[PDB]
Tab-separated table of N, CA, C and O in Angstrom:
chain	number	residue	atom	x	y	z
S	22	UNK	N	0.834	-1.185	0.000
S	22	UNK	CA	0.000	0.000	0.000
S	22	UNK	C	0.857	1.218	0.000
S	22	UNK	O	2.046	1.204	0.296
S	23	UNK	N	0.282	2.342	-0.388
S	23	UNK	CA	0.975	3.532	-0.284
S	23	UNK	C	1.241	3.957	1.179
S	23	UNK	O	2.311	4.505	1.489
S	24	UNK	N	0.302	3.645	2.085
S	24	UNK	CA	0.478	3.978	3.528
S	24	UNK	C	1.770	3.238	4.093
S	24	UNK	O	2.616	3.797	4.823
S	25	UNK	N	1.936	1.993	3.659
S	25	UNK	CA	3.084	1.170	4.125
S	25	UNK	C	4.356	1.756	3.653
S	25	UNK	O	5.291	1.943	4.435
S	26	UNK	N	4.407	2.195	2.402
S	26	UNK	CA	5.556	2.921	1.882
S	26	UNK	C	5.869	4.214	2.648
S	26	UNK	O	7.053	4.537	2.886
S	27	UNK	N	4.796	4.954	2.993
S	27	UNK	CA	5.021	6.237	3.719
S	27	UNK	C	5.612	5.965	5.105
S	27	UNK	O	6.566	6.699	5.482
S	28	UNK	N	5.072	4.930	5.751
S	28	UNK	CA	5.599	4.485	7.052
S	28	UNK	C	7.046	4.041	6.897
S	28	UNK	O	7.945	4.409	7.731
S	29	UNK	N	7.350	3.307	5.826
S	29	UNK	CA	8.727	2.903	5.588
S	29	UNK	C	9.674	4.059	5.318
S	29	UNK	O	10.871	4.081	5.728
S	30	UNK	N	9.213	5.112	4.657
S	30	UNK	CA	10.028	6.273	4.430
S	30	UNK	C	10.349	7.024	5.775
S	30	UNK	O	11.472	7.554	5.919
S	31	UNK	N	9.347	7.147	6.633
S	31	UNK	CA	9.444	7.747	8.006
S	31	UNK	C	10.503	6.930	8.772
S	31	UNK	O	11.398	7.526	9.348
S	32	UNK	N	10.432	5.607	8.713
S	32	UNK	CA	11.454	4.741	9.408
S	32	UNK	C	12.847	4.978	8.828
S	32	UNK	O	13.851	5.081	9.582
S	33	UNK	N	12.975	5.135	7.502
S	33	UNK	CA	14.210	5.385	6.896
S	33	UNK	C	14.792	6.686	7.306
S	33	UNK	O	16.026	6.807	7.556
S	34	UNK	N	13.958	7.707	7.393
S	34	UNK	CA	14.438	8.989	7.833
S	34	UNK	C	14.814	8.999	9.358
S	34	UNK	O	15.789	9.644	9.719
S	35	UNK	N	14.054	8.306	10.145
S	35	UNK	CA	14.475	8.164	11.575
S	35	UNK	C	15.827	7.488	11.656
S	35	UNK	O	16.690	7.899	12.469
S	36	UNK	N	16.029	6.442	10.832
S	36	UNK	CA	17.282	5.708	10.799
S	36	UNK	C	18.407	6.631	10.449
S	36	UNK	O	19.504	6.542	11.081
S	37	UNK	N	18.227	7.535	9.462
S	37	UNK	CA	19.206	8.563	9.137
S	37	UNK	C	19.560	9.440	10.303
S	37	UNK	O	20.732	9.759	10.518
S	38	UNK	N	18.545	9.886	11.012
S	38	UNK	CA	18.791	10.821	12.117
S	38	UNK	C	19.515	10.068	13.267
S	38	UNK	O	20.512	10.604	13.798
S	39	UNK	N	19.041	8.873	13.594
S	39	UNK	CA	19.725	8.006	14.605
S	39	UNK	C	21.130	7.664	14.223
S	39	UNK	O	22.029	7.568	15.100
S	40	UNK	N	21.447	7.512	12.924
S	40	UNK	CA	22.842	7.276	12.562
S	40	UNK	C	23.700	8.471	12.875
S	40	UNK	O	24.837	8.295	13.392
S	41	UNK	N	23.220	9.689	12.635
S	41	UNK	CA	23.961	10.883	12.973
S	41	UNK	C	24.116	10.999	14.542
S	41	UNK	O	25.197	11.407	15.037
S	42	UNK	N	23.013	10.726	15.251
S	42	UNK	CA	23.070	10.674	16.735
S	42	UNK	C	24.134	9.682	17.225
S	42	UNK	O	24.967	10.038	18.126
S	43	UNK	N	24.165	8.491	16.648
S	43	UNK	CA	25.082	7.428	17.079
S	43	UNK	C	26.501	7.878	16.859
S	43	UNK	O	27.367	7.696	17.733
S	44	UNK	N	26.755	8.563	15.722
S	44	UNK	CA	28.084	9.005	15.429
S	44	UNK	C	28.540	10.039	16.383
S	44	UNK	O	29.687	9.973	16.866
S	45	UNK	N	27.644	10.949	16.745
S	45	UNK	CA	27.937	12.014	17.677
S	45	UNK	C	28.195	11.424	19.099
S	45	UNK	O	29.130	11.837	19.801
S	46	UNK	N	27.382	10.444	19.498
S	46	UNK	CA	27.590	9.830	20.841
S	46	UNK	C	28.894	9.048	20.853
S	46	UNK	O	29.659	9.114	21.868
S	47	UNK	N	29.223	8.297	19.796
S	47	UNK	CA	30.433	7.520	19.773
S	47	UNK	C	31.706	8.410	19.765
S	47	UNK	O	32.738	8.080	20.301
S	48	UNK	N	31.577	9.625	19.245
S	48	UNK	CA	32.716	10.555	19.349
S	48	UNK	C	33.030	10.970	20.773
S	48	UNK	O	34.169	11.447	21.015
S	49	UNK	N	32.055	10.888	21.675
S	49	UNK	CA	32.232	11.125	23.071
S	49	UNK	C	32.901	9.988	23.824
S	49	UNK	O	32.951	10.036	25.103
S	50	UNK	N	33.324	8.963	23.083
S	50	UNK	CA	34.088	7.798	23.651
S	50	UNK	C	35.339	7.665	22.887
S	50	UNK	O	35.566	6.725	22.110
S	51	UNK	N	36.223	8.673	23.084
S	51	UNK	CA	37.420	8.588	22.213
S	51	UNK	C	38.372	7.429	22.517
S	51	UNK	O	39.106	7.005	21.675
S	52	UNK	N	38.287	6.885	23.740
S	52	UNK	CA	39.072	5.711	24.073
S	52	UNK	C	38.546	4.369	23.437
S	52	UNK	O	39.230	3.337	23.476
S	53	UNK	N	37.341	4.427	22.805
S	53	UNK	CA	36.722	3.226	22.269
S	53	UNK	C	36.427	2.109	23.283
S	53	UNK	O	36.389	0.955	22.980
S	54	UNK	N	36.174	2.571	24.507
S	54	UNK	CA	35.842	1.657	25.586
S	54	UNK	C	34.518	0.942	25.329
S	54	UNK	O	34.367	-0.263	25.683
S	55	UNK	N	33.601	1.609	24.627
S	55	UNK	CA	32.221	1.100	24.416
S	55	UNK	C	31.999	0.651	22.994
S	55	UNK	O	30.849	0.307	22.572
S	56	UNK	N	33.047	0.559	22.200
S	56	UNK	CA	32.912	0.250	20.789
S	56	UNK	C	32.472	-1.114	20.421
S	56	UNK	O	31.802	-1.318	19.422
S	57	UNK	N	32.844	-2.097	21.267
S	57	UNK	CA	32.594	-3.488	20.965
S	57	UNK	C	32.014	-4.261	22.176
S	57	UNK	O	32.188	-3.811	23.299
S	58	UNK	N	31.343	-5.394	21.982
S	58	UNK	CA	30.899	-6.203	23.118
S	58	UNK	C	31.968	-6.568	24.057
S	58	UNK	O	33.109	-6.833	23.611
S	59	UNK	N	31.723	-6.559	25.349
S	59	UNK	CA	32.635	-7.153	26.318
S	59	UNK	C	32.891	-8.600	25.913
S	59	UNK	O	31.988	-9.372	25.557
S	60	UNK	N	34.171	-8.949	25.767
S	60	UNK	CA	34.582	-10.305	25.367
S	60	UNK	C	34.370	-11.392	26.484
S	60	UNK	O	34.856	-11.238	27.549
S	61	UNK	N	33.600	-12.434	26.191
S	61	UNK	CA	33.337	-13.467	27.157
S	61	UNK	C	34.495	-14.395	27.246
S	61	UNK	O	34.661	-15.114	28.229
S	62	UNK	N	35.422	-14.316	26.279
S	62	UNK	CA	36.695	-15.023	26.461
S	62	UNK	C	37.522	-14.364	27.496
S	62	UNK	O	38.077	-15.033	28.357
S	63	UNK	N	37.616	-13.030	27.461
S	63	UNK	CA	38.376	-12.219	28.412
S	63	UNK	C	37.696	-11.894	29.796
S	63	UNK	O	38.383	-11.560	30.808
S	64	UNK	N	36.352	-11.893	29.807
S	64	UNK	CA	35.565	-11.671	31.029
S	64	UNK	C	34.533	-12.788	31.121
S	64	UNK	O	33.332	-12.648	30.826
S	65	UNK	N	35.001	-14.007	31.491
S	65	UNK	CA	34.127	-15.163	31.370
S	65	UNK	C	32.885	-15.194	32.264
S	65	UNK	O	31.915	-15.759	31.821
S	66	UNK	N	32.919	-14.450	33.356
S	66	UNK	CA	31.758	-14.356	34.265
S	66	UNK	C	30.787	-13.234	33.865
S	66	UNK	O	29.848	-12.995	34.616
S	67	UNK	N	30.996	-12.548	32.730
S	67	UNK	CA	30.277	-11.278	32.542
S	67	UNK	C	28.751	-11.435	32.631
S	67	UNK	O	28.024	-10.559	33.183
S	68	UNK	N	28.222	-12.475	32.032
S	68	UNK	CA	26.787	-12.658	31.936
S	68	UNK	C	26.169	-13.089	33.266
S	68	UNK	O	24.955	-12.965	33.380
S	69	UNK	N	26.983	-13.442	34.277
S	69	UNK	CA	26.487	-13.649	35.600
S	69	UNK	C	26.128	-12.284	36.208
S	69	UNK	O	25.330	-12.193	37.147
S	70	UNK	N	26.821	-11.206	35.786
S	70	UNK	CA	26.665	-9.878	36.338
S	70	UNK	C	25.674	-9.093	35.478
S	70	UNK	O	24.794	-8.380	36.067
S	71	UNK	N	25.820	-9.085	34.197
S	71	UNK	CA	25.098	-8.207	33.269
S	71	UNK	C	24.195	-9.071	32.367
S	71	UNK	O	24.646	-9.913	31.580
S	72	UNK	N	22.910	-8.809	32.534
S	72	UNK	CA	21.940	-9.641	31.827
S	72	UNK	C	21.632	-9.238	30.427
S	72	UNK	O	21.182	-10.061	29.601
S	73	UNK	N	21.852	-7.942	30.079
S	73	UNK	CA	21.607	-7.462	28.761
S	73	UNK	C	22.860	-6.590	28.320
S	73	UNK	O	22.777	-5.358	28.359
S	74	UNK	N	23.895	-7.274	27.911
S	74	UNK	CA	25.062	-6.519	27.394
S	74	UNK	C	24.717	-5.608	26.189
S	74	UNK	O	23.801	-5.926	25.382
S	75	UNK	N	25.445	-4.500	26.033
S	75	UNK	CA	25.225	-3.637	24.903
S	75	UNK	C	26.570	-2.932	24.594
S	75	UNK	O	27.404	-2.729	25.501
S	76	UNK	N	26.652	-2.432	23.383
S	76	UNK	CA	27.877	-1.748	22.915
S	76	UNK	C	27.543	-1.006	21.600
S	76	UNK	O	26.509	-1.319	20.995
S	77	UNK	N	28.404	-0.120	21.153
S	77	UNK	CA	28.090	0.630	19.972
S	77	UNK	C	28.043	-0.208	18.683
S	77	UNK	O	27.222	0.084	17.784
S	78	UNK	N	28.877	-1.217	18.532
S	78	UNK	CA	28.781	-2.052	17.346
S	78	UNK	C	27.469	-2.796	17.227
S	78	UNK	O	26.852	-2.894	16.141
S	79	UNK	N	26.962	-3.271	18.350
S	79	UNK	CA	25.700	-4.000	18.415
S	79	UNK	C	24.597	-3.011	18.053
S	79	UNK	O	23.671	-3.374	17.305
S	80	UNK	N	24.652	-1.797	18.570
S	80	UNK	CA	23.631	-0.793	18.236
S	80	UNK	C	23.659	-0.490	16.727
S	80	UNK	O	22.595	-0.378	16.079
S	81	UNK	N	24.840	-0.398	16.154
S	81	UNK	CA	24.962	-0.032	14.750
S	81	UNK	C	24.332	-1.139	13.900
S	81	UNK	O	23.686	-0.837	12.848
S	82	UNK	N	24.522	-2.408	14.289
S	82	UNK	CA	23.903	-3.562	13.551
S	82	UNK	C	22.360	-3.432	13.577
S	82	UNK	O	21.663	-3.534	12.531
S	83	UNK	N	21.813	-3.191	14.750
S	83	UNK	CA	20.394	-2.966	14.861
S	83	UNK	C	19.932	-1.764	14.016
S	83	UNK	O	18.909	-1.857	13.291
S	84	UNK	N	20.618	-0.665	14.098
S	84	UNK	CA	20.243	0.534	13.375
S	84	UNK	C	20.187	0.248	11.888
S	84	UNK	O	19.250	0.661	11.200
S	85	UNK	N	21.189	-0.436	11.372
S	85	UNK	CA	21.263	-0.623	9.909
S	85	UNK	C	20.276	-1.610	9.352
S	85	UNK	O	19.978	-1.567	8.162
S	86	UNK	N	19.705	-2.438	10.191
S	86	UNK	CA	18.578	-3.244	9.891
S	86	UNK	C	17.264	-2.471	10.105
S	86	UNK	O	16.189	-3.118	10.256
S	87	UNK	N	17.367	-1.135	10.265
S	87	UNK	CA	16.181	-0.339	10.706
S	87	UNK	C	15.415	-0.927	11.881
S	87	UNK	O	14.155	-0.912	11.918
S	88	UNK	N	16.132	-1.438	12.922
S	88	UNK	CA	15.532	-2.034	14.044
S	88	UNK	C	15.155	-1.147	15.237
S	88	UNK	O	14.643	-1.653	16.209
S	89	UNK	N	15.372	0.162	15.092
S	89	UNK	CA	14.862	1.114	16.070
S	89	UNK	C	13.592	1.816	15.500
S	89	UNK	O	13.713	2.638	14.653
S	90	UNK	N	12.506	1.543	16.147
S	90	UNK	CA	11.192	2.133	15.678
S	90	UNK	C	10.956	3.549	16.125
S	90	UNK	O	10.148	4.266	15.527
S	91	UNK	N	11.638	3.968	17.190
S	91	UNK	CA	11.466	5.276	17.760
S	91	UNK	C	12.765	5.603	18.541
S	91	UNK	O	13.610	4.695	18.749
S	92	UNK	N	12.891	6.845	18.966
S	92	UNK	CA	14.085	7.298	19.695
S	92	UNK	C	14.136	6.620	21.073
S	92	UNK	O	15.293	6.317	21.573
S	93	UNK	N	13.034	6.325	21.745
S	93	UNK	CA	13.052	5.655	23.049
S	93	UNK	C	13.791	4.330	23.000
S	93	UNK	O	14.620	4.035	23.893
S	94	UNK	N	13.549	3.549	21.971
S	94	UNK	CA	14.237	2.253	21.826
S	94	UNK	C	15.768	2.425	21.711
S	94	UNK	O	16.512	1.623	22.287
S	95	UNK	N	16.208	3.404	20.948
S	95	UNK	CA	17.609	3.735	20.734
S	95	UNK	C	18.189	4.201	22.073
S	95	UNK	O	19.251	3.721	22.535
S	96	UNK	N	17.514	5.093	22.745
S	96	UNK	CA	18.020	5.534	24.062
S	96	UNK	C	18.110	4.414	25.075
S	96	UNK	O	19.027	4.447	25.931
S	97	UNK	N	17.197	3.471	25.060
S	97	UNK	CA	17.257	2.339	25.952
S	97	UNK	C	18.591	1.590	25.791
S	97	UNK	O	19.240	1.288	26.854
S	98	UNK	N	18.999	1.372	24.540
S	98	UNK	CA	20.252	0.653	24.238
S	98	UNK	C	21.431	1.522	24.721
S	98	UNK	O	22.400	1.001	25.321
S	99	UNK	N	21.398	2.829	24.437
S	99	UNK	CA	22.505	3.678	24.938
S	99	UNK	C	22.639	3.665	26.444
S	99	UNK	O	23.749	3.528	27.001
S	100	UNK	N	21.525	3.714	27.110
S	100	UNK	CA	21.541	3.694	28.571
S	100	UNK	C	22.068	2.341	29.073
S	100	UNK	O	22.773	2.345	30.091
S	101	UNK	N	21.814	1.239	28.388
S	101	UNK	CA	22.378	-0.035	28.763
S	101	UNK	C	23.914	-0.035	28.721
S	101	UNK	O	24.575	-0.566	29.607
S	102	UNK	N	24.461	0.603	27.692
S	102	UNK	CA	25.950	0.680	27.582
S	102	UNK	C	26.458	1.304	28.897
S	102	UNK	O	27.437	0.797	29.553
S	103	UNK	N	25.920	2.453	29.278
S	103	UNK	CA	26.370	3.221	30.437
S	103	UNK	C	26.106	2.459	31.733
S	103	UNK	O	26.991	2.364	32.615
S	104	UNK	N	24.844	2.053	31.906
S	104	UNK	CA	24.431	1.457	33.146
S	104	UNK	C	25.119	0.114	33.428
S	104	UNK	O	25.489	-0.176	34.581
S	105	UNK	N	25.370	-0.679	32.396
S	105	UNK	CA	26.062	-1.971	32.541
S	105	UNK	C	27.484	-1.695	33.102
S	105	UNK	O	27.956	-2.316	34.050
S	106	UNK	N	28.111	-0.696	32.481
S	106	UNK	CA	29.497	-0.377	32.875
S	106	UNK	C	29.588	0.119	34.274
S	106	UNK	O	30.558	-0.238	35.014
S	107	UNK	N	28.660	0.968	34.668
S	107	UNK	CA	28.683	1.525	36.007
S	107	UNK	C	28.335	0.526	37.138
S	107	UNK	O	28.565	0.811	38.328
S	108	UNK	N	27.742	-0.595	36.755
S	108	UNK	CA	27.520	-1.676	37.737
S	108	UNK	C	28.750	-2.626	37.785
S	108	UNK	O	29.216	-2.903	38.867
S	109	UNK	N	29.249	-3.053	36.637
S	109	UNK	CA	30.324	-4.030	36.629
S	109	UNK	C	31.641	-3.478	37.134
S	109	UNK	O	32.392	-4.141	37.882
S	110	UNK	N	31.890	-2.194	36.845
S	110	UNK	CA	33.171	-1.560	37.199
S	110	UNK	C	33.029	-0.670	38.373
S	110	UNK	O	31.975	0.071	38.516
S	111	UNK	N	34.010	-0.556	39.258
S	111	UNK	CA	33.945	0.330	40.395
S	111	UNK	C	34.160	1.756	40.027
S	111	UNK	O	34.741	2.106	38.972
S	112	UNK	N	33.820	2.660	40.946
S	112	UNK	CA	33.956	4.117	40.736
S	112	UNK	C	35.333	4.598	40.404
S	112	UNK	O	35.509	5.596	39.691
S	113	UNK	N	36.357	3.930	40.927
S	113	UNK	CA	37.757	4.321	40.749
S	113	UNK	C	38.418	3.811	39.451
S	113	UNK	O	39.658	3.898	39.301
S	114	UNK	N	37.629	3.396	38.476
S	114	UNK	CA	38.184	2.788	37.307
S	114	UNK	C	38.022	3.677	36.120
S	114	UNK	O	37.069	4.476	36.028
S	115	UNK	N	38.933	3.481	35.130
S	115	UNK	CA	38.840	4.276	33.894
S	115	UNK	C	37.538	3.928	33.130
S	115	UNK	O	36.969	4.755	32.462
S	116	UNK	N	37.042	2.700	33.305
S	116	UNK	CA	35.811	2.275	32.640
S	116	UNK	C	34.591	3.027	33.191
S	116	UNK	O	33.794	3.604	32.414
S	117	UNK	N	34.427	3.023	34.525
S	117	UNK	CA	33.303	3.749	35.124
S	117	UNK	C	33.344	5.204	34.724
S	117	UNK	O	32.319	5.820	34.402
S	118	UNK	N	34.559	5.797	34.892
S	118	UNK	CA	34.697	7.225	34.613
S	118	UNK	C	34.367	7.550	33.154
S	118	UNK	O	33.776	8.635	32.868
S	119	UNK	N	34.744	6.663	32.248
S	119	UNK	CA	34.412	6.890	30.818
S	119	UNK	C	32.902	6.901	30.622
S	119	UNK	O	32.365	7.650	29.843
S	120	UNK	N	32.215	5.999	31.316
S	120	UNK	CA	30.770	5.934	31.220
S	120	UNK	C	30.083	7.201	31.740
S	120	UNK	O	29.103	7.710	31.158
S	121	UNK	N	30.578	7.754	32.866
S	121	UNK	CA	30.036	9.003	33.388
S	121	UNK	C	30.180	10.109	32.341
S	121	UNK	O	29.208	10.890	32.134
S	122	UNK	N	31.339	10.195	31.750
S	122	UNK	CA	31.610	11.264	30.811
S	122	UNK	C	30.785	11.110	29.547
S	122	UNK	O	30.250	12.119	29.023
S	123	UNK	N	30.605	9.873	29.100
S	123	UNK	CA	29.744	9.577	27.940
S	123	UNK	C	28.289	9.896	28.230
S	123	UNK	O	27.589	10.578	27.401
S	124	UNK	N	27.777	9.571	29.420
S	124	UNK	CA	26.443	9.914	29.810
S	124	UNK	C	26.250	11.451	29.810
S	124	UNK	O	25.234	12.012	29.261
S	125	UNK	N	27.185	12.168	30.393
S	125	UNK	CA	27.032	13.616	30.576
S	125	UNK	C	27.103	14.307	29.226
S	125	UNK	O	26.203	15.164	28.911
S	126	UNK	N	28.054	13.927	28.398
S	126	UNK	CA	28.191	14.536	27.084
S	126	UNK	C	27.105	14.095	26.136
S	126	UNK	O	26.658	14.928	25.292
S	127	UNK	N	26.608	12.891	26.252
S	127	UNK	CA	25.590	12.361	25.315
S	127	UNK	C	24.232	12.978	25.576
S	127	UNK	O	23.382	13.090	24.651
S	128	UNK	N	23.994	13.381	26.819
S	128	UNK	CA	22.714	13.984	27.234
S	128	UNK	C	22.375	15.180	26.395
S	128	UNK	O	21.213	15.373	26.012
S	129	UNK	N	23.393	15.982	26.085
S	129	UNK	CA	23.231	17.200	25.300
S	129	UNK	C	22.724	16.864	23.862
S	129	UNK	O	21.781	17.450	23.331
S	130	UNK	N	23.338	15.849	23.276
S	130	UNK	CA	23.053	15.357	21.935
S	130	UNK	C	21.637	14.798	21.915
S	130	UNK	O	20.798	15.072	21.014
S	131	UNK	N	21.312	13.998	22.916
S	131	UNK	CA	19.996	13.376	22.960
S	131	UNK	C	18.860	14.358	23.228
S	131	UNK	O	17.746	14.141	22.716
S	132	UNK	N	19.136	15.406	23.983
S	132	UNK	CA	18.145	16.441	24.206
S	132	UNK	C	17.711	17.064	22.872
S	132	UNK	O	16.490	17.228	22.632
S	133	UNK	N	18.636	17.333	21.947
S	133	UNK	CA	18.230	17.999	20.720
S	133	UNK	C	17.672	16.959	19.739
S	133	UNK	O	16.802	17.329	18.900
S	134	UNK	N	18.135	15.705	19.808
S	134	UNK	CA	17.590	14.659	19.008
S	134	UNK	C	16.129	14.492	19.261
S	134	UNK	O	15.345	14.311	18.339
S	135	UNK	N	15.723	14.541	20.508
S	135	UNK	CA	14.317	14.418	20.835
S	135	UNK	C	13.479	15.564	20.234
S	135	UNK	O	12.400	15.324	19.725
S	136	UNK	N	14.001	16.780	20.304
S	136	UNK	CA	13.293	17.923	19.705
S	136	UNK	C	13.127	17.686	18.212
S	136	UNK	O	12.050	17.956	17.713
S	137	UNK	N	14.167	17.197	17.518
S	137	UNK	CA	14.155	16.962	16.039
S	137	UNK	C	13.212	15.842	15.627
S	137	UNK	O	12.461	15.923	14.623
S	138	UNK	N	13.213	14.782	16.421
S	138	UNK	CA	12.301	13.705	16.175
S	138	UNK	C	10.858	14.182	16.279
S	138	UNK	O	10.061	13.871	15.380
S	139	UNK	N	10.526	14.913	17.341
S	139	UNK	CA	9.179	15.515	17.527
S	139	UNK	C	8.838	16.560	16.453
S	139	UNK	O	7.738	16.523	15.848
S	140	UNK	N	9.776	17.477	16.238
S	140	UNK	CA	9.620	18.554	15.251
S	140	UNK	C	9.327	18.008	13.832
S	140	UNK	O	8.244	18.285	13.285
S	141	UNK	N	10.264	17.238	13.255
S	141	UNK	CA	10.083	16.616	11.914
S	141	UNK	C	8.961	15.560	11.891
S	141	UNK	O	8.435	15.257	10.818
S	142	UNK	N	8.604	15.018	13.061
S	142	UNK	CA	7.622	13.938	13.186
S	142	UNK	C	8.299	12.614	12.884
S	142	UNK	O	7.908	11.958	11.927
């Protein structure tokens, strides 16, 4: 139907905007601490601690399959990256501290993303 096509175009355009958001958030992790899944070879107990692992590569795979239907779903995954790290790692670690800085800097980006998503529809 034509309605299905219009819905698909809206999803495509959201995907475009989320790709720009993802790039901007990933620039706030210049150490690449959050770039890839935590390795279960290197951290074999990880899944005993963290039930829903997340990372920027995993998000990018979902995004490119147009698997984010709205900005809330995308933010949920971003918050998992941060929140997982802040539980597994202690406050005195470069990992925790990177997550704090990514959360604080990403908030600014996400605030305007929400306005754009609402504004453009």
